[PDB]
Amino acid sequence: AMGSMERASLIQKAKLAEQAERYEDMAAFMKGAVEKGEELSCEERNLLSVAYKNVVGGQRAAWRVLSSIEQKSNEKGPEVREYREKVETELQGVCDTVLGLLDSHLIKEAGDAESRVFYLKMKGDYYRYLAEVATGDDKKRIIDSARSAYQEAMDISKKEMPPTNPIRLGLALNFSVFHYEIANSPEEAISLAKTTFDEAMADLHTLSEDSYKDSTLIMQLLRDNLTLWT
């Protein structure tokens, strides 16, 4: 389908799709671009992430709406359960597609510590989304996959990136969310967030006006999560 289209054209159309707020189209164009086998630039990595983030985001929001309506059973017909299952299956199919792309093309031993952390964080995020809806032995298996991916991304970031690096901050941010919401470890989540914030705060004076904007943006999200968790 996309195989007959030049890589550059696929990137142009993904940008068009984004302008038109056609994020499902945007994800299909980027998937095709990745499947060309060539590495993604920083710009192209973010196009990919933005595309599938919007797709799975809408599904997660819909799954949550339906799940709470379903949980309010005696504080009934099967329609709510059935439709929630439909959405769930669809959410899972998107996550599987992203994980399939990461394992098959994107996650590599080569490359800078920026691409490597980016993709490993992405793998953790989308196993986390899968964990949000799993249940049994499949769930533990999923949580282990998220943990393992976040940890390997974590190890690379703390060794090859300064504390204010935005990608390192966003990874730590999402890892702390993983602890609080998936692993059920609020102490670890709070500790990781506070540690990430304070260590970045101490190095903010070494940054330019642009870096200062990127770092503080994510740090405020750490602040928001902390004030809520404690």
């Binding site: 983030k53 985001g57 964080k121 995020d125 999402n174 969310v177 999200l221 999560n225 968790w229």
Partner: peptide, 8 residues
């Protein structure tokens, strides 16, 4: 709710 990277 808990904010992640998706939340800008």
């Amino acid at each position: 709710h808990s904010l992640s990277t998706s939340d800008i």
